Amino acid sequence: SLRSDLINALYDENQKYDVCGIISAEGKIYPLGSDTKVLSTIFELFSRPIINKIAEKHGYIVEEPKQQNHYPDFTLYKPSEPNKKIAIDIKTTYTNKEKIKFTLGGYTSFIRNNTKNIVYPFDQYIAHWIIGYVYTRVLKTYNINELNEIPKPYKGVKVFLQDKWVIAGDLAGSGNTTNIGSIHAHYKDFVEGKGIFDSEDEFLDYWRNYERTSQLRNDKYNNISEYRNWIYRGRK
Amino acid sequence: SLRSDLINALYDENQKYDVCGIISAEGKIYPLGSDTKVLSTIFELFSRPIINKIAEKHGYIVEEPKQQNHYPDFTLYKPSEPNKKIAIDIKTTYTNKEKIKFTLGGYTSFIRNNTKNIVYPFDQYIAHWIIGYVYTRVATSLKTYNINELNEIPKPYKGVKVFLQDKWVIAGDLAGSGNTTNIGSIHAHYKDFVEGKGIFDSEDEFLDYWRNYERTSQLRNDKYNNISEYRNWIYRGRK
DNA sequence: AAAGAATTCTT
DNA sequence: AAAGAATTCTT
Ligand SMILES: [Ca+2]
Ligand SMILES: [Ca+2]
């Protein structure tokens, strides 16, 4: 399937190539920094041609946002299945050596409002996948004949393709910017889909009614157990 | 000086090189995106060796943050004069085609707390420079390339302009962001950023304004929302 | 504008 | 944890 092929292609490109710098049209290369700010940009760029290659091979047209501040990174869809769009987001985090966690987008935009900050209305998508990259964190300019001399910036890099609701956790990924938090676990649990929600509807419901601060949550629900007791009582 | 040489260096580099893609140790090149999230990263990496050469010429040690949410991008200091450090931050914005604006960092962090989210206590910095890049967004690749196709890789910008200017000099009186409490710059033509045609009387005034600026309109309504109101707040007795 | 989206990290 | 830091943008 598109999905199986996509993750094979990503996993494979990852195994075969090591990004080591930025290059200019004149052939001047500048090394890369070791922060997620840099690496996430690089990992997104590394992924783009792979995504487009696999999608085309499956007849899906790929679309990226025209406006900055819009979800998702890539919207795929064959013209015959307009209401069966698939949203793919690229997420990154790091490790110093170990469990990981990702921020999974806002819980106050498109999930609460069909057209809010999303390329196509929320209800036209049938899948929201997360291409997650994890790297172990590790001054001159170079020439092409120096490609392997350039110090690389990451010790390892792992990639997975998993459904968003599936790796979604019950605690906010960030405060002031209201992000959904992932599960906090080892890489394996993301690949295996060992999350906390039983269904995509439970994920959506939980985050569509999650309150912004502990103050509030303390009277409704803060975690999954409390949310289920909250559901049990009648949303009481 | 360090400053003039740095500015000199940046202009020449930006003039000599057009960044076009990321390269892997194996020679495969991936094109760049044309959004600020990408370009800002590209611009910073482009500046770093240069900032480093120049700093070396003038006997300055360059230090970058160890943690990820720390100001500034680069801290320069003579080993002999640790308390006369220079903070250099790289900011980026674009022109769709013209007046521009930048976001100049938090107004609730290190400026309100000597050690909040800053590599070295704020009081150890004697200057805070901003290297600003402005690129025109290309109206308009998902292919990869090889070392011999450099010229065919499409560039994510029509034009790029860079300047070095003090932070206070280009600061404005309206927030650069809401929820993330950022200082906003003057909304003006590139020329004014280069020429330092700002709004504050001094750096002392810049800092005081941003240190006493309220987070949301409601709050600001009983204090000040602009430079005139701040000047009036001052007269009233910071009352 | 003022407020709140877009991404991820740290104390 | 939470809450709020790092950046830039949209309306
Ligand atoms: Ca996205
Ligand atoms: Ca993107």
Side-chain angles (χ1 to χ4, degrees), chain A residues 1-15 17-33 36 38-55 58-65 70-96 99-100 102-136 138-139 141-144 146-148 150-151 153-193 195-214 216-217 220-235, chain B residues 1-15 17-36 38-52 54-55 57-65 69-95 100 102-139 141-150 153-190 192-196 198-217 219-220 223-238:
Chain A
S1 54
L2 171 70
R3 181 177 178 161
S4 70
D5 281 352
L6 184 48
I7 190 47
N8 278 9
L10 296 171
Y11 183 99
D12 189 45
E13 195 79 2
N14 184 251
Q15 294 295 158
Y17 307 102
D18 270 340
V19 175
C20 61
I22 292 290
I23 196 184
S24 56
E26 309 72 26
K28 204 191 179 180
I29 306 158
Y30 305 80
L32 310 162
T36 300
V38 174
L39 298 171
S40 61
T41 275
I42 272 69
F43 296 157
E44 219 245 354
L45 301 178
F46 186 80
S47 305
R48 301 176 57 266
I50 313 166
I51 292 176
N52 164 66
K53 171 169 178 174
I54 300 309
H58 285 254
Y60 282 86
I61 303 283
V62 194
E63 276 181 33
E64 289 184 78
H70 268 20
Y71 169 92
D73 287 342
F74 302 88
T75 281
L76 291 59
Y77 73 101
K78 53 225 284 191
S80 32
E81 300 175 19
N83 292 180
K84 287 181 194 178
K85 291 183 185 87
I86 181 278
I88 315 190
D89 241 18
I90 306 187
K91 304 303 195 185
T92 313
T93 191
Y94 78 97
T95 192
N96 274 118
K99 297 190 201 302
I100 64 184
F102 298 81
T103 48
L104 306 176
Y107 59 82
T108 74
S109 52
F110 48 88
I111 83 162
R112 295 185 190 213
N113 188 281
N114 205 42
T115 31
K116 171 95 156 291
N117 291 281
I118 182 163
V119 178
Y120 285 94
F122 192 67
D123 67 10
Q124 305 188 351
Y125 294 88
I126 41 70
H128 302 270
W129 303 336
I130 294 299
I131 298 174
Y133 284 85
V134 194
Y135 69 91
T136 312
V138 97
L139 298 175
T141 50
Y142 299 74
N143 274 297
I144 286 153
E146 294 173 312
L147 283 187
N148 325 96
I150 304 179
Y154 49 80
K155 218 179 163 183
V157 180
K158 291 175 184 177
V159 65
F160 67 67
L161 180 74
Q162 185 58 277
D163 289 271
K164 180 170 159 176
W165 78 264
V166 169
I167 58 170
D170 55 349
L171 305 175
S174 73
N176 49 0
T177 53
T178 60
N179 261 233
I180 289 179
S182 89
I183 54 184
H184 176 45
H186 289 277
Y187 173 67
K188 151 192 173 172
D189 305 298
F190 288 85
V191 173
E192 300 179 19
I196 58 154
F197 294 97
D198 293 341
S199 67
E200 181 160 33
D201 285 23
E202 200 191 35
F203 157 74
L204 279 180
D205 195 55
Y206 181 94
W207 287 106
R208 273 162 170 168
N209 301 274
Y210 183 88
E211 295 296 348
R212 291 153 222 243
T213 52
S214 306
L216 309 180
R217 294 192 284 271
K220 198 181 192 178
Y221 63 82
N222 286 72
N223 50 38
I224 194 56
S225 297
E226 290 164 29
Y227 159 84
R228 287 167 177 166
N229 304 340
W230 181 76
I231 279 298
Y232 190 80
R233 285 185 193 254
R235 298 168 88 67
Chain B
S1 54
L2 164 64
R3 179 180 176 135
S4 66
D5 279 351
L6 183 42
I7 311 183
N8 284 173
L10 299 167
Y11 179 91
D12 290 347
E13 252 269 334
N14 176 260
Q15 210 85 183
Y17 309 116
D18 283 303
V19 161
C20 68
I22 60 171
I23 192 161
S24 62
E26 301 73 26
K28 194 204 267 50
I29 302 155
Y30 307 70
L32 296 169
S34 41
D35 59 283
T36 308
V38 175
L39 288 179
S40 69
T41 294
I42 298 326
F43 292 156
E44 309 192 67
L45 301 185
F46 182 82
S47 308
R48 183 203 286 189
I50 320 161
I51 292 191
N52 256 101
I54 308 308
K57 173 175 174 174
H58 299 267
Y60 283 82
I61 294 168
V62 179
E63 275 185 33
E64 295 178 82
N69 298 301
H70 271 32
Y71 168 82
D73 293 337
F74 309 80
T75 288
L76 285 60
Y77 70 104
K78 313 276 271 297
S80 47
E81 296 180 282
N83 318 280
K84 299 174 101 182
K85 297 183 166 81
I86 310 178
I88 311 177
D89 228 28
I90 309 203
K91 310 291 183 175
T92 311
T93 190
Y94 76 98
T95 24
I100 68 185
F102 285 93
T103 44
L104 314 168
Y107 62 68
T108 73
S109 53
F110 52 83
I111 74 164
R112 299 195 187 201
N113 174 290
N114 190 50
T115 36
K116 197 176 214 310
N117 291 101
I118 188 159
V119 187
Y120 283 100
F122 189 67
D123 59 26
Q124 287 165 33
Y125 292 90
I126 51 80
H128 296 276
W129 300 341
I130 295 296
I131 296 170
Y133 282 86
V134 203
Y135 69 90
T136 311
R137 41 135 74 141
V138 285
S141 179
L142 303 153
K143 184 191 169 194
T144 58
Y145 299 85
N146 92 297
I147 241 74
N148 309 89
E149 299 174 287
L150 290 183
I153 303 178
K155 282 148 198 178
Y157 47 81
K158 184 165 308 184
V160 181
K161 293 184 196 88
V162 60
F163 69 67
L164 195 182
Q165 185 54 271
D166 291 87
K167 178 157 159 185
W168 77 266
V169 175
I170 59 173
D173 57 356
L174 303 179
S177 74
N179 49 18
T180 52
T181 61
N182 250 231
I183 298 167
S185 86
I186 58 185
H187 176 31
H189 289 284
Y190 174 71
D192 301 341
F193 287 78
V194 180
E195 295 182 299
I199 64 169
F200 284 109
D201 290 333
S202 57
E203 175 167 34
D204 178 272
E205 203 188 39
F206 150 70
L207 273 170
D208 192 55
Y209 180 91
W210 287 110
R211 285 167 166 168
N212 303 276
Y213 185 91
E214 298 294 326
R215 298 159 179 72
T216 325
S217 291
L219 298 162
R220 296 204 288 278
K223 208 169 171 191
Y224 60 86
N225 283 280
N226 76 339
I227 196 63
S228 302
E229 284 171 29
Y230 160 73
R231 284 163 180 163
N232 202 272
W233 174 74
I234 289 309
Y235 159 75
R236 297 188 297 256
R238 303 180 67 78

